[PDB]
Amino acid sequence: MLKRPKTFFDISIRGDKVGKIVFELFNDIVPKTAENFRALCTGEKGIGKSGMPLSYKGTMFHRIIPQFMIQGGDFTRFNGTGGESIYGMKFDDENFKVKHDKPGLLSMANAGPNTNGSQFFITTVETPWLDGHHCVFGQVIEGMDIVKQIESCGTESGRPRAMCMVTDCGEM
Amino acid sequence: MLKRPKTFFDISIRGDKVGKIVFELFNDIVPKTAENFRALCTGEKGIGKSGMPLSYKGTMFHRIIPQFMIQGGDFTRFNGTGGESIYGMKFDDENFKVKHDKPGLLSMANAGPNTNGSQFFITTVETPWLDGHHCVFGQVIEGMDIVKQIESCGTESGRPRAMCMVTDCGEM
């Protein structure tokens, strides 16, 4: 019998520590996707195939769209073109059971079907149009205000107006 | 009678504060170029033409080449395609009096002649091949170890292996 894992990001904005976001991952619904996020928070898998630490520590939210989502998780290229899962470069969309039906959902970014690596995004609104297309695997249980601070650094193109960093992360 | 201005960057690497770099700017040799760096350290010019704060606070070293230089200063795009001077988008190469003849020199990055904005770079070796082509305008007087820590995050393509941030900056 397994519990939902908890992870956290420590956030800083524009160089200043702002607080902590705490996630709960649905390992009961998408075990393989949740477990990817869990390991990348802990860095426990060491050095990935790209020769980089498999860890969100020191990563940026490189795409931020107000009234939509914030996106991060690229720890090989820090610009949205990289990232790597614990399973390899890419892994398949596990399932689409959970809907983007509320704010503060954790969901896998992808460049098409079954291209999951390490990039994730956090919704700040309902985004049902992403249902069936991005795999929701956990939710924000603490720190939605921090999410809304990062969101407030965004533009409609997604280009950020400020650098928001995961300065530390791990499992609680 | 004017003294050389001093500025500083507070650095963090991979999310951890590492220390401070202190510069001395040759306002006696390149007054207009030094003054651009001075203002952008203080943020005193407020909001630039691109609608962003004219400030290095929260900016990244987006290009890092070991046994060469580290490059930062893009506060409009955070990837090497942006930046803005206090004089406008671009300003002319002031002069080329000072040579890239020692480590720890501050020099203006450019995409060709007279395209100076806000991107700078710090040499960690002698780079005489950049003489006559990039405008040297100050030097590192404290924290060369921090420069060498950032450099150690680089690759030969210039892609960084870690996120090194100016978390605070100003004039001393």
Numbering used by the authors:
A (entry chain A), B (entry chain A): 1 to 172
Copy text from the publication.
TvCyP1 is a cyclophilin present in the parasite Trichomonas vaginalis (T. vaginalis) showing high sequence identity to HcypA. However, for Myb1, the nuclear translocation is regulated by TvCyP1. The interaction of TvCyP1 with Myb1 leads to the cytoplasmic release of Myb1 from membrane-bound vesicles, an important step preceding translocation to nucleus. By and large, our study reports for the first time the structure of a catalytically active dimeric cyclophilin possessing only a single cyclophilin domain and provides structural details of its interaction with an intriguing biological substrate.
